[PDB]
Enzyme design. Structure first.
Site, mmCIF file in Angstrom:
data_model
loop_
_atom_site.group_PDB
_atom_site.id
_atom_site.type_symbol
_atom_site.label_atom_id
_atom_site.label_comp_id
_atom_site.label_asym_id
_atom_site.label_seq_id
_atom_site.Cartn_x
_atom_site.Cartn_y
_atom_site.Cartn_z
ATOM 1 N N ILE A 163 57.568 -56.930 97.360
ATOM 2 C CA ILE A 163 58.026 -55.854 96.481
ATOM 3 C C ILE A 163 56.810 -55.047 96.047
ATOM 4 O O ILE A 163 56.801 -53.827 96.198
ATOM 5 C CB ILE A 163 58.859 -56.346 95.255
ATOM 6 N N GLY A 164 55.796 -55.718 95.509
ATOM 7 C CA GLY A 164 54.626 -55.030 94.993
ATOM 8 C C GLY A 164 53.685 -55.932 94.229
ATOM 9 O O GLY A 164 53.658 -57.147 94.446
ATOM 10 N N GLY A 199 52.544 -56.798 90.264
ATOM 11 C CA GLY A 199 52.779 -56.702 88.831
ATOM 12 C C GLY A 199 51.547 -57.051 88.026
ATOM 13 O O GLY A 199 50.478 -57.308 88.590
ATOM 14 N N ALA A 200 51.683 -57.073 86.699
ATOM 15 C CA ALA A 200 50.545 -57.357 85.823
ATOM 16 C C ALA A 200 49.972 -58.772 86.010
ATOM 17 O O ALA A 200 48.944 -59.069 85.405
ATOM 18 C CB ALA A 200 50.934 -57.141 84.361
ATOM 19 N N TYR A 201 50.620 -59.636 86.833
ATOM 20 C CA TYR A 201 50.164 -61.005 87.076
ATOM 21 C C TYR A 201 49.681 -61.255 88.516
ATOM 22 O O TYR A 201 48.669 -61.918 88.708
ATOM 23 C CB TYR A 201 51.288 -61.994 86.736
ATOM 24 N N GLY A 202 50.402 -60.745 89.517
ATOM 25 C CA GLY A 202 50.033 -60.954 90.921
ATOM 26 C C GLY A 202 51.077 -60.446 91.896
ATOM 27 O O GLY A 202 51.774 -59.479 91.584
ATOM 28 N N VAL A 253 54.527 -60.034 93.815
ATOM 29 C CA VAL A 253 55.959 -60.259 93.613
ATOM 30 C C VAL A 253 56.694 -59.966 94.930
ATOM 31 O O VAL A 253 56.399 -58.968 95.605
ATOM 32 C CB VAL A 253 56.529 -59.458 92.406
ATOM 33 N N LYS A 311 57.670 -64.067 91.225
ATOM 34 C CA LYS A 311 56.342 -63.623 90.902
ATOM 35 C C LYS A 311 55.367 -64.759 91.106
ATOM 36 O O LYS A 311 55.635 -65.840 90.608
ATOM 37 C CB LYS A 311 56.304 -63.204 89.430
ATOM 38 N N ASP A 339 54.453 -54.333 73.392
ATOM 39 C CA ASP A 339 54.068 -53.499 74.523
ATOM 40 C C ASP A 339 55.298 -52.908 75.217
ATOM 41 O O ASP A 339 55.430 -52.876 76.439
ATOM 42 C CB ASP A 339 53.210 -54.275 75.508
HETATM 43 C C1 LIG Z 1 57.946 -56.469 82.943
HETATM 44 C C2 LIG Z 1 57.624 -55.885 84.305
HETATM 45 C C3 LIG Z 1 58.311 -56.599 85.449
HETATM 46 O O1 LIG Z 1 58.372 -57.825 85.481
HETATM 47 N N1 LIG Z 1 58.838 -55.797 86.416
HETATM 48 C C4 LIG Z 1 59.735 -56.151 87.399
HETATM 49 N N2 LIG Z 1 60.198 -55.252 88.231
HETATM 50 C C5 LIG Z 1 61.081 -55.832 89.133
HETATM 51 C C6 LIG Z 1 61.256 -57.146 88.952
HETATM 52 S S1 LIG Z 1 60.319 -57.755 87.631
HETATM 53 C C7 LIG Z 1 62.160 -57.989 89.802
HETATM 54 O O2 LIG Z 1 63.098 -57.170 90.524
HETATM 55 C C8 LIG Z 1 62.407 -56.106 91.207
HETATM 56 C C9 LIG Z 1 61.800 -55.114 90.220
#
Ligand SMILES: *CCC(=O)Nc1nc2c(s1)COCC2
Ligand SMILES: *CCC(=O)Nc1nc2c(s1)COCC2
EC number: 2.7.11.24
Length: 334
Positions: free
Chosen positions: A21-22, A24-27, A29, A44, A135
Site C-alpha cells: 500500500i505504502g 506510514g508513520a511506522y513502516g 503497510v 502494518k 494530532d
Molecule cells: C493513522 C494513519 C493510518 O494508519 N493510515 C491508514 N491508511 C490506510 C490504512 S491505515 C489501512 O487501509 C488502507 C489505508
C-alpha cells in the site's frame, strides 16, 4: 517467509496475497487476504530499541472499542522476547484517508456534515476516556468505500491534565504544526480537551475549501496565520494570558481585523460556519466542547446522544519497553 519490495513481510500463513500500500508513520503497510475471515485486511510492519509511541498506541487501541476509532484485529510477533523483532498490526482495510481525499475530491455539504459528525462522535469517546488525541489532521481520518470514518494514530495521545497545562512562551511542541491551537505557541502544553477541538475546527475549514486554513511555515508563523483570520485577541482574552512574555508578544503586534467566515468560505452552509467559529475560538476556555459541537444545529440530522457512546472508565529503559510491548500483545497468541 514472504517478501514485498526487497523487504521481509512475514505475516504467517494466515495472511497471504500481499499487496504493497505504502509507507506510514511506522513502516511498510500492505493489504493481505485474511484466510480466516475471508476478507482483505491492512497490515502494518513495526520494526525496532522500540518507540514509546508504539506501546502507547497499542495500549490505547486495544482498550478502546468504538465505530469511529480504528481497532486492532490481530498482532503478529515471535513467541518469545528473545526472538521478537518485528511486530505486525492487522486492521480493517480502508479505502483512503481525508488527506488523500481532499487532494483530489470536492466534498458535498452532506459529506462534510457526515464526516464532521463521525469525527466528533469518535472524539466524544476518546475525551470520555480522559484521553487527548493531540494530532488530529486529515491523514489520521480513514474512510471506507461507504464513507464510514475512523480516527487513527494515537502516538502523541496523552491523559488529560488541565491542572498542569501551563507553560512559558515558545515552548516546543511535537504535534503537526498547521492543526495546533494558538495557545500552544503562547502558554499551553496541550494537556486539555480544547486542543483537539481546535484541530477539528481546522479540519472542518479544510473540508470546506480543500486547503489548510492555517498553513504556517514555522512555529510562530502558525500564530500569525491564526491571527490573520481571527484578528487580534480582545482585551479580555489577552488578559487571560498571564505569562508576560506571551502577553507582550501579542501586544507588540499591529492590530488585525477579523476575516469573516462567509468571505473565506462563500459556498459554505451558514450553520457550518457558526460551528466553525465556535471551534476556532482563540480563548480555549470559550471554545466549544465536543458534546456541545455534536448538539449544534449543523449536525441535527445525526445528533443522537444515546447512539454516541462513551468509555466505561477513564484511561522506562528500552528493555522494559520491549517487555511491555511483548506483554501488551500476548492476547493474540494462540
Ligand atoms: C493513522 C494513519 C493510518 O494508519 N493510515 C491508514 N491508511 C490506510 C490504512 S491505515 C489501512 O487501509 C488502507 C489505508
Ligand atoms: C481568563 C480565562 C477565561 O477566559 N476563563 C473562562 N472561564 C469560562 C469561560 S471563559 C466561559 O465559559 C465559562 C467558564
Amino acid at each position: 517467509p514472504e517478501m514485498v519490495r526487497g523487504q521481509v513481510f512475514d505475516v504467517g500463513p494466515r495472511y497471504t496475497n500481499l499487496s504493497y500500500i505504502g509507507e506510514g508513520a511506522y513502516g511498510m503497510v500492505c493489504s493481505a487476504y485474511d484466510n480466516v475471515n475471508k476478507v482483505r485486511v491492512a497490515i502494518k510492519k513495526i520494526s525496532p530499541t522500540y518507540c514509546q509511541r508504539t506501546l502507547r498506541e497499542i495500549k490505547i487501541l486495544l482498550r478502546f472499542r468504538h465505530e469511529n476509532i480504528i481497532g486492532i484485529n490481530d498482532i503478529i510477533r515471535a513467541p518469545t522476547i528473545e526472538q521478537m523483532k518485528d511486530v505486525y498490526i492487522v486492521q480493517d482495510l480502508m479505502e483512503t484517508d481525508l488527506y488523500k481525499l481532499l487532494k483530489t475530491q470536492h466534498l458535498s455539504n452532506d459529506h462534510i456534515c457526515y464526516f464532521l459528525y463521525q469525527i466528533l462522535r469518535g472524539l466524544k469517546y476518546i475525551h470520555s476516556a480522559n484521553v487527548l488525541h493531540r494530532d488530529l489532521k486529515p491523514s489520521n481520518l480513514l474512510l471506507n468505500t461507504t464513507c464510514d470514518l475512523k480516527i487513527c494514530d494515537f502516538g502523541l495521545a496523552r491523559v488529560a491534565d488541565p491542572d498542569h497545562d501551563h507553560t512559558g512562551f515558545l515552548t516546543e511542541y511535537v504535534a503537526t504544526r498547521w492543526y495546533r491551537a494558538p495557545e500552544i505557541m503562547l502558554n499551553s502544553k496541550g494537556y486539555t480537551k480544547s486542543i483537539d477541538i481546535w484541530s477539528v475546527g481546522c479540519i472542518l475549514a479544510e473540508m470546506l475549501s480543500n486547503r489548510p486554513i492555517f498553513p504556517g511555515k514555522h512555529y510562530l508563523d502558525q500564530l500569525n496565520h491564526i491571527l490573520g483570520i481571527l484578528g487580534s485577541p480582545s482585551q479580555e482574552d489577552l488578559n487571560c494570558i498571564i505569562n508576560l512574555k506571551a502577553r507582550n508578544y501579542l501586544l507588540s503586534l499591529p492590530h488585525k481585523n477579523k476575516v469573516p467566515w462567509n468571505r473565506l468560505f462563500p459556498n459554505a452552509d451558514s450553520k457550518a460556519l457558526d460551528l466553525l467559529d465556535k471551534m476556532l475560538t482563540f480563548n480555549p476556555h470559550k471554545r466549544i466542547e465536543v458534546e456541545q459541537a455534536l448538539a449544534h444545529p449543523y449536525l441535527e440530522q445525526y445528533y443522537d446522544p444515546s447512539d454516541e457512546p462513551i468509555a466505561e472508565a477513564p484511561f522506562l529503559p528500552k528493555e522494559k519497553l520491549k517487555e511491555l510491548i511483548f506483554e501488551e500483545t500476548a492476547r493474540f497468541q494462540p
